[model samples]
Target: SMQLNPESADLRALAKHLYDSYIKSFPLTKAKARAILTGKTTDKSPFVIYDMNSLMMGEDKIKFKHITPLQEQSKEVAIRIFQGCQFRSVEAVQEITEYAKSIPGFVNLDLNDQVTLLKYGVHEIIYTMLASLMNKDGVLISEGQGFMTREFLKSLRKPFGDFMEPKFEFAVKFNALELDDSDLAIFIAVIILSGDRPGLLNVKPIEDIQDNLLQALELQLKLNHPESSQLFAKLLQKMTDLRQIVTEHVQLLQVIKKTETDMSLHPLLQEIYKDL
Candidate 1:
């Protein structure tokens, strides 16, 4: 079991309680319950920063006068992001930009710093996502040993509550995780499965095949009994649930304690959210 930090013990305990509840209940399809908690379905794209922004920003842009503080205006600037089917880079850019928002004092950053922040976000999300999937099968083989339970996963949602909440907003826009629509589609498919099945997701249907002509050789039994193939669909489903729970926990680390600092350590922040 992972050691719980003193500061985060309460959250961990809460997660454990939730996990126990689910295990005791052994509920079927926690997807609905998860949707109620996170208000998202499995098909729901994690990329939803833009649509929420549009609802927040009634006008195209909010006008701020000279009286507005630079730091405050920086915070006030609304960055819009969304999922688009036609433009591949657009979506990746949007994802990266959403990531940049998590950085402390990112709004007040200079152009160069802002660019660097964008790069950092791209690297974090890209590599982390890549690394997670690179050994997808390895995770499944462990049978949740290397994975987190639903309880711990729920706790991560709390720390990043603001961003994970129904409404999260941003201002500046930059495309960093440049991936195409088809790639996005494939990626989403891969992530959904990876999150659920980890490894062993690509298993072909088990079937019985006739061996060498032992019966014809007159030495072996000639009787044959056919059996139907079986699928470990439940195992795959649980694997995805654990994967997503872990992801939620990682995302919480990004905005757990954010505040404005002129000299922000956004790079460090990105590094924390990313791991192999």
Candidate 2:
């Protein structure tokens, strides 16, 4: 308790709570999806995910055919894809907000600071979580059973297509660590509780919370993955990579929003990207 001891009973308890809240947040987990299909999501929030691995030979081609009109390679198609993502962004916000509220000290943060953290933090968390939907070939997302091949995504003209390449690149690289829900629970928590976010009202208190998460995460990495020597060091670099990804995404979106007057974005996204 005095110096962020990972072995302490208090830290272990915090990890347990964080893991429980977080494990249900992502739709990508097979067990989570199975539970949802079985109507076991009454107590938890629910959203849909495109499960490509479950597909059979010509299964999608027969009845589950293209959710989005894929034959077109234009901004129209790009915006439609982007719009689908925006709709799901609503649920994404809900997931992050719920998880953030669950962490012990998060509620004590200045009310405005809570918003700031989610505002900045959710994008980063969701970006990392995108790994579950992606492969080196491409990503499956709807917001369909939509499977947009990496080559198709790249072929779309200019900035509309440009947006995804980096994301998939990052996801492909990040997924190398093969993180599951439990590690992601604490991993994402540490990101949300970061002290460096803009407009944090009480940095020290937030720092205190983040330090605990780091200790918990450190213990988790040691216990679960002690074989990899530089995992923690690499994890920090991944976090740093996310910072730039979120920043660049905002910049690119702003540019896209400016050029494509007909292309729409959600108010929540506009607001999140507004001041940033």
Candidate 3:
């Protein structure tokens, strides 16, 4: 059985479901899958990361901002990505933005209510990116210019304007030597799965990601980069999977929508959704 916690349960169920769905949809060699699941030799690079507030360009205090194109047109993308999806916590987008707004640079910034702090929240970002990528026929998005689109670019007064730290850019890095096989495996899995689908990064379907993460767990009994990535990946993947399953099972999603005619009839499920 999966954990009782809403997030944990959702993750576990979703993973199992997606795995099953993927396998069922397209069966292949266990050995081949295992090979892809194993660890790799070449590793990720390193870099320094910083919060947007403290960033500076030379002596001037720099301001962080999103490109204007995305700001103007993200709604069309957001709806297309989220429509009929299982994990739907985008309601937090506003709350996340509000929190970001509290940060000095964004407090008075003229960004939309929806595109606030939630855009930066680590979890929310993963969700947004994943939802966009996983939608049928959707293109793989980049955290860089490749993902942000030209319209999104012209919309911004300045490009890559999110940070102004001199000689320092904010980012997370993966180090192969520091991680074990299981850690490596999980890391690879996330990168592969996340960027997969149509027009994902054209790379091998490496399987060692999961293996490396598990290996780290068995040996050091600790979590590493791969493990950390896997932890979140599982959470997101599970949410995606479970939502897919429920939608397939019945019109629970739409049928439930009709129940709004009488609010008294289903206050419970709304609370349940909140808990989730």
The full ranking of all candidates by lDDT, starting with the best, is 2, 3, 1
Q: Which regions of candidate 3 deviate over 4 angstroms? A: 1-155, 158-160, 163-172, 175-276
Clashing pairs in 2: 84-143
lDDT of 2 by residue, 81-136 (tens): 56656766767889889889998899988999999999988889888777666777
Whole-model alpha-carbon lDDT for candidate 1? 0.28
* Candidate 1 residue lDDT tens string, 174-211: 11222222122222222221111212222221000011
| RMSD to truth, every model | 21.7, 6.7, 20.2
Alpha-carbon runs more than 4 Å astray in model 1: 1-90, 130-276
- C-alpha lDDT of all candidate models, in order: 0.28, 0.72, 0.28
Q: Model 1: which ten-residue window has the lowest total lDDT?
A: 166-175
Give the distance in Å from residue 33's predicted Cα in candidate 2 to where it truly belongs. Answer: 8.8
Name the TM-score of candidate 3: 0.19
Candidate 3 lDDT score relative to the true structure = 0.28
lDDT string for model 3 (200-229, tens) is 222232223333333323323232333443
The residue ranges of model 2 lying beyond 4 angstroms of the native Cα positions read 1-7, 30-75, 142-144
